[PDB]
């Protein structure tokens, strides 16, 4: 719904004020690093069924108390969801690196996510552990630190955007809580 | 004054009337149900009318695609939310016929009960487009393009705002689409004495709810009844 | 907001699938046209008030009957009311000039223009051929680019044929 | 179709609208894709056929278990068999580069895998095993441009990312 | 639902064969023509406004038969109703051009019209006559060839643009008659 | 829990009427038949471990490629991934064999089932792969009969119809 | 009909699944039903008009107001036209007898029987004494047994309280 450009725009409204030549010449810095933008999306979304395994897998074994019978990963039919529930967060945090902005997480699913869990039980604590694999694995995936792949490009800069990716993760935490 | 309980700009959804009014709205919208499938499986037979799934992986899969529109009608915004609660005390009304007065009350204040007769009479009312059927091409072509203007509510400006998005997972839309057409062909026929019961009350849920006036529309009901009842204009934004 | 990136990830949205390489393809277009396309927003926000003051008198020039009894325009704030309306209509072109697509001209421009006009007696036609003034006041001196006063030629006529 | 320029000519459908100024900005940057990657698409039409076969061998190569009795690979025509689908599944990326997007797969390979797979009982994840070994043959010299083999290398693994 | 690009890969499909080189000059045709085409689609929808307040307009005053109390252009009840069975069609030939294929046109709108349009009582014959119009607005609007309208843009032949257009104005006159 | 009691009475709840004379036969049916469907639970109440061990990896017996660097059953509390998981099987068919009918297989079992190893690149007929190593062990001598021997057949089929 | 293989086959109807095991247990007790169940099935036709003529003319003695103006029996149309009815349905009841379940009292008997009394002014009334003439004379001295005896009067006043 909104984006990097769309966030210039509806503070300048807020103001009454018009779209300058200072106040956007920050807008195509976003066009200087443009195809950086569009190098270290394909990284996230040709590993992204490996990485759906690779989270719900490794989380459980630190705490594997829920996958036992009372738990909340206990049934296949309880895994199923889970399969569901994680596929579509990095489904959606997709979306807000090729945006730029953090509004795509915060109203396709965020909205509505803290009084179900609370209905339907789910851990605050083991949510966000499964999350901060998939942090570790995007910073591993958009530079060439990942553990077998290596996506060879021409290298440069990568760490602007990892920070980027960072301050996108860590707010699934902030309504998870 | 301030520093309490109350808000400047907080995010209800309206329509709260305290915790002790949820509780009697959703009992109250499931004995809607309760009293809606009291004629599909009302002999004692589940009937061709039901059919949750056409095979094994379709079956089990059709929970999701319901519970999942649970919550993506659920995490509307603070308008939309607000326009429904006023639209189900104008639609729902036009339900009902007799204006009584004990039925006017329940159905002004309990949003998930007038959420739910207008829902469940277009199911006992075999007056849905999943229930329909053209005989002539004059027919067809009339009755798909008032479901290509009810894409409009879905997108209004160009960008599709998520309340179609018809599955979450990478496979669910094939999932979702072979049930469409499975169930046109569930509901093909559906009796001998079918194609009335789905023809002539499609007659009588356009002309006496929407259009009071507008007599050459009425006159096209009389002419083509199935786009009397793929018209939808119950705005449920989809 | 119908910008160019929320085009092509609301119809993954409506699958319920990953971006690909034809959302990818978008975003080249965003590259190119933007060394060109956005080149004119800093040359309608350096002189807004000398072109819209060309904007506001060109309606009454040309309407003259405005400015009397009985009508729209009868004492002078009625002429400098008039004025922040046709202000609003450039603010919402360079607005729309960054993000590439007709998103705050539909939703905030023409969303709910058809009622409030005819009800306060106030015509669409002063709006239009007002700003159809400034569709002959184009070209490659001194204005933008040749290929930057096309990607602002058609945001006018954005406006031109949905009030119509 | 999936397709850049089969997408957004049906989004301006169901609103009722026109081609406006934010899908006829993805059309040019199919122009900036296409003079990189339909040149990486006659290279695979070179070859329909020296690289099925060694991809008919890694699915072979390391799943020796199919020449048991009651399996997949049961004889040579059922070895002959496997050689084909990966002919389509090199056609298949052969009109994923040429027409701009994942149209076919959507359509007609990915839909229905799930229960092809289940019903027929046909191991998925010897399919995987065979597109994967054609993934790693792109280089530098030798091969499509290194601006080329990007394109090449998004739809190959996409493949192995649905069946995964 | 298809384009120039998908075209010639379900005539790939009739032998099940491939597209390479001298398979591709049909599509290198197509990518070669690419900022006359993108010139030649909003030459349409800029003015498309007073191109059905110029046709069915150009219809009256032609033919004021329509206007007559018992005709089927009467009252604005019928007359905006005129003012959207034209108004549709400007969209899906303009997507035509775009997609390289009449594709569109066919799927959405033109099966079954001329069945359609006779059980409306619809006069056929005026039909046509609004929209042989149609066919001469485009090919003097992505040439310079109007009276006021100069949307000059730079250099170079769109004739052959022309040419094709009314390969998308032809098939709906063999749909409605 | 679809069973011979839920399901005759939710038959009677569908239609909001009374308990009906249709239903008191079906409930008949399962008074006779806890004479092997109840007598055919407890030959596996007192075998665990037993029936899981040789024919756990009699899976990876015939299936040699399990076992490589970068696949499955790697190390040994994977393979004890392995063997729990068909410790679940047999414990969710004891409780089938209690209820009345398929039940607690599809809810618990069964729901759900078939991405849930494809996601996690299991083969799925390796699953299969052991049930039916052991649904030939039904025997008259040194168990209960072949009459009970119908009722260990009716649970352990479906469970091969479920990855099917 | 809602017999209980027409119950049962509709509930695997009503997902779209095979007919396992619970539906296979739902009619093994007809074995232990039908073989006497069904020996309840002659006593009625050995009385057709029998037990109706000695039953429905007591209903004229304890309801002796409908010889009065305005009612049915005023004539002698209306006294073969009471007991026929009962012959219709003295017939279906046997006819729910004979399929086990409850279809042909729902499927011609009493589907609409709300409306069929009270334009007719026909009291529904008469129709309880039409069965408590014949309830209460379910005796296993001089008649068969109480195995065929435990759904008899369970079916007939079953019948008065679906008109109640
Ligand atoms: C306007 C009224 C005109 C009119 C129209 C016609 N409608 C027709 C059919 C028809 N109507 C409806 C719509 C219904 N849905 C619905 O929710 C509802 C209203 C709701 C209540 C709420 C409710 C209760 C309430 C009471 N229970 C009481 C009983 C007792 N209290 C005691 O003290 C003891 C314990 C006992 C007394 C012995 C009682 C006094 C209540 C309050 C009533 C009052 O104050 O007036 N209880 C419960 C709990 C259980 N009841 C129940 O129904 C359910 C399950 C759903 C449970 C668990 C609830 C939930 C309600 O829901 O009942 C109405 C009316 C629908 C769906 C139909 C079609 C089906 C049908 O046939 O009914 C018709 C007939 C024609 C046709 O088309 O069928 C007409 C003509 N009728 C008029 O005459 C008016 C002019
Ligand atoms: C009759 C003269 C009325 C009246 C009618 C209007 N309806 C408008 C839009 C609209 N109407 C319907 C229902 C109607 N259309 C159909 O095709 C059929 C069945 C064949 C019926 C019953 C729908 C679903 C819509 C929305 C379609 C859309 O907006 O795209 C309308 C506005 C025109 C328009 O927007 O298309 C009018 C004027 N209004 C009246 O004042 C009288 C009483
Ligand atoms: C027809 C719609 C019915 C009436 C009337 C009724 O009372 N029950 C319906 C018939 C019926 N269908 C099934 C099988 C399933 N029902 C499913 C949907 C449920 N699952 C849900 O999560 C929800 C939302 C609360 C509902 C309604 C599904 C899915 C199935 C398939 C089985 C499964 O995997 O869950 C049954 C159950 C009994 C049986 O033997 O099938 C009934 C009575
Ligand atoms: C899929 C195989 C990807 C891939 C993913 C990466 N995983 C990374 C870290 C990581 N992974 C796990 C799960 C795994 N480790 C376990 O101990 C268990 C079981 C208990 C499992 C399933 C965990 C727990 C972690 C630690 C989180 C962290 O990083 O702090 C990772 C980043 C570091 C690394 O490379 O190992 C990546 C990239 N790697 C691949 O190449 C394929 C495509
Ligand atoms: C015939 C129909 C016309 C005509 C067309 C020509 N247009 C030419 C170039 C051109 N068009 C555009 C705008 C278009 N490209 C986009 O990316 C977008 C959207 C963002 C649009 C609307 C641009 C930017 C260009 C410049 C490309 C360039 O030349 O560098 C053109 C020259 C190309 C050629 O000769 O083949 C022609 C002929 N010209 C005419 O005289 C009539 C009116
Ligand atoms: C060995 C013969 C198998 C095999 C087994 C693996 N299963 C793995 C994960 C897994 N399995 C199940 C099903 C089972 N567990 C349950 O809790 C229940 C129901 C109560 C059932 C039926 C589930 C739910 C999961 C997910 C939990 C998890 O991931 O631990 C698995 C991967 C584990 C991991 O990587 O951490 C393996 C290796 N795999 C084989 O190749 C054969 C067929
Ligand atoms: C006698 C003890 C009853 C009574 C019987 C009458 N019924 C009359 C007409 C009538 N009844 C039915 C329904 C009924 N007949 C059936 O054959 C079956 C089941 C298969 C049922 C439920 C129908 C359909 C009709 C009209 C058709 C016809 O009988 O030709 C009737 C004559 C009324 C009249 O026509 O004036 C009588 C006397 N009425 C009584 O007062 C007691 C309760
Ligand atoms: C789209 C069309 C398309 C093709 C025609 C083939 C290209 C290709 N790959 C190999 C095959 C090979 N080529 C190499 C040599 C290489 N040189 C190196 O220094 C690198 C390691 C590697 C690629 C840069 C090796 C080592 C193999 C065999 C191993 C393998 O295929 O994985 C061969 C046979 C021998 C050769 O010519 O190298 C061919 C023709 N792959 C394609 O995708
Ligand atoms: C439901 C309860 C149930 C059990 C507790 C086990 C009983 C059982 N059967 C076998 C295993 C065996 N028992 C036999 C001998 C047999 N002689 C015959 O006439 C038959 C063909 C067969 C017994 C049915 C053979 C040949 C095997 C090995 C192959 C097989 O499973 O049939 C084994 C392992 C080795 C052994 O002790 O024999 C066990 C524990 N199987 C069950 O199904
Ligand atoms: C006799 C009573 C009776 C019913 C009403 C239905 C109830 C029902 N509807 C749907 C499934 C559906 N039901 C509708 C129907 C509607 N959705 C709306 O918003 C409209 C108000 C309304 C009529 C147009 C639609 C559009 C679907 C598709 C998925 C969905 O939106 O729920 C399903 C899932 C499986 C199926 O398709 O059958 C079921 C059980 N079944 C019954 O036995
Ligand atoms: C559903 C989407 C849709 C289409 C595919 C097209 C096609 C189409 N046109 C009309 C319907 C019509 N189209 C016209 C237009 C004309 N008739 C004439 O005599 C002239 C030749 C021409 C004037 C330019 C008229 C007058 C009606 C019928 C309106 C009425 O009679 O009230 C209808 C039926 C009702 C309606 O939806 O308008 C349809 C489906 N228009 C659409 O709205
Ligand atoms: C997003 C864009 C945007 C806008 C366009 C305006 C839209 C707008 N205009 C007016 C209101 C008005 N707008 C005009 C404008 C004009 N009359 C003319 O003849 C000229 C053509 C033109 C300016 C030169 C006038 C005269 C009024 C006052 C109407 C009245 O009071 O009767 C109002 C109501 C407020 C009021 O009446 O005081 C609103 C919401 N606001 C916005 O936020
Ligand atoms: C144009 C669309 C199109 C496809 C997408 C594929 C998909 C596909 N494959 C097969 C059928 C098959 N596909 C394979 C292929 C393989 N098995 C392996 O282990 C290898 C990984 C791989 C080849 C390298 C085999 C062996 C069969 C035959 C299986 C059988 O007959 O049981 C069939 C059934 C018809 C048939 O071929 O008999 C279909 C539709 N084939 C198509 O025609």
């Keep these: 719904m909104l984006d990097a450009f769309s966030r210039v725009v509806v503070n300048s409204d807020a103001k009454a004020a018009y779209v300058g030549g200072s106040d956007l010449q920050a807008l195509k810095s976003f066009i200087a690093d443009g195809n950086k933008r569009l190098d270290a999306v394909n990284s996230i979304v040709s590993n992204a069924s490996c990485m759906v395994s690779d989270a719900v897998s490794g989380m459980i074994c630190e705490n594997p108390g829920l996958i036992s019978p009372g738990g909340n990963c206990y049934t296949n039919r309880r895994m199923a969801a889970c399969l569901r529930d994680g596929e579509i967060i990095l489904r959606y945090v997709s979306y807000a690196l090729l945006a730029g902005d953090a509004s795509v997480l915060e109203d396709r699913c965020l909205n509505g996510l803290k009084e179900t869990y609370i209905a339907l039980g789910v851990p605050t604590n083991s949510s966000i552990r499964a999350v901060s694999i998939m942090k570790a694995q995007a910073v591993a995936f958009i530079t060439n630190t990942a553990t077998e792949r290596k996506m060879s490009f021409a290298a440069g800069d990568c760490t602007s955007l990892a920070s980027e990716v960072a301050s996108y993760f860590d707010r699934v935490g902030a309504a998870i809580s | 004054k301030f520093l309490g309980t109350l808000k400047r700009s907080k995010d209800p959804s309206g329509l709260r009337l305290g915790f002790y009014g949820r509780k009697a709205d959703d009992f109250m919208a499931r004995s809607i149900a309760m009293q809606a499938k009291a004629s599909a499986a009302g002999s004692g037979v589940y009937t061709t009318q039901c059919s949750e799934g056409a095979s094994k992986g379709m079956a089990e899969n059709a929970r999701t695609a319901s519970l999942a529109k649970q919550f993506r009608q659920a995490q509307r915004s603070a308008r939309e939310m607000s326009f429904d609660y006023y639209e189900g005390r104008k639609y729902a009304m036009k339900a009902v016929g007799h204006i009584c007065n004990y039925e006017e009350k329940i159905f002004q204040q309990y949003n998930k009960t007038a959420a739910a007769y207008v829902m469940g009479k277009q199911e006992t009312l075999l007056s849905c487009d999943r229930y329909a059927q053209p005989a002539n091409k004059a027919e067809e072509y009339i009755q798909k393009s008032v479901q290509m203007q009810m894409k409009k509510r879905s997108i209004p400006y160009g960008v599709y705002t998520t309340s179609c998005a018809d599955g979450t997972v990478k496979g669910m839309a094939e999932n979702a689409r072979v049930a469409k057409e499975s169930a046109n062909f569930r509901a093909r026929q559906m009796s001998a004495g079918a194609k009335a019961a789905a023809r002539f009350n499609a007659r009588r849920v356009a002309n006496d709810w929407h259009n009071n006036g507008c007599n050459y529309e009425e006159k096209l009901t009389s002419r083509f009844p199935a786009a009397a009842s793929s018209v939808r204009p119950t705005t449920n934004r989809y | ?164």
Tied chains: 1, 5.
């Design chain 3, 1 to 164: 907001m119908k910008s160019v990136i929320t085009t092509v990830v609301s119809a993954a949205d409506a699958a319920g699938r990953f971006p690909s390489n034809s959302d990818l393809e978008s975003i080249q277009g965003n590259i190119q046209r933007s060394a060109a396309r956005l080149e004119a927003a800093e040359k309608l926000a350096g002189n807004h008030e000398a072109v819209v003051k060309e904007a506001g008198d060109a309606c009454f020039a040309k309407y003259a009957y405005l400015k009397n009894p009985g009508e729209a325009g009868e004492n002078q704030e009625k002429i400098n009311k008039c004025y922040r309306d046709v202000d609003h209509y450039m603010r919402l072109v360079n607005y729309c000039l960054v993000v590439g697509g007709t998103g705050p001209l539909d939703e905030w421009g023409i969303a709910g223009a058809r009622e409030v006009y005819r009800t306060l007696n106030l015509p669409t036609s002063a709006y239009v051929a007002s700003i159809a003034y400034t569709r002959d006041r184009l070209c490659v001196p001194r204005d933008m680019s040749a290929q930057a006063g096309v990607e602002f030629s058609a945001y006018l006529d954005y406006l031109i044929n949905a009030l119509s």
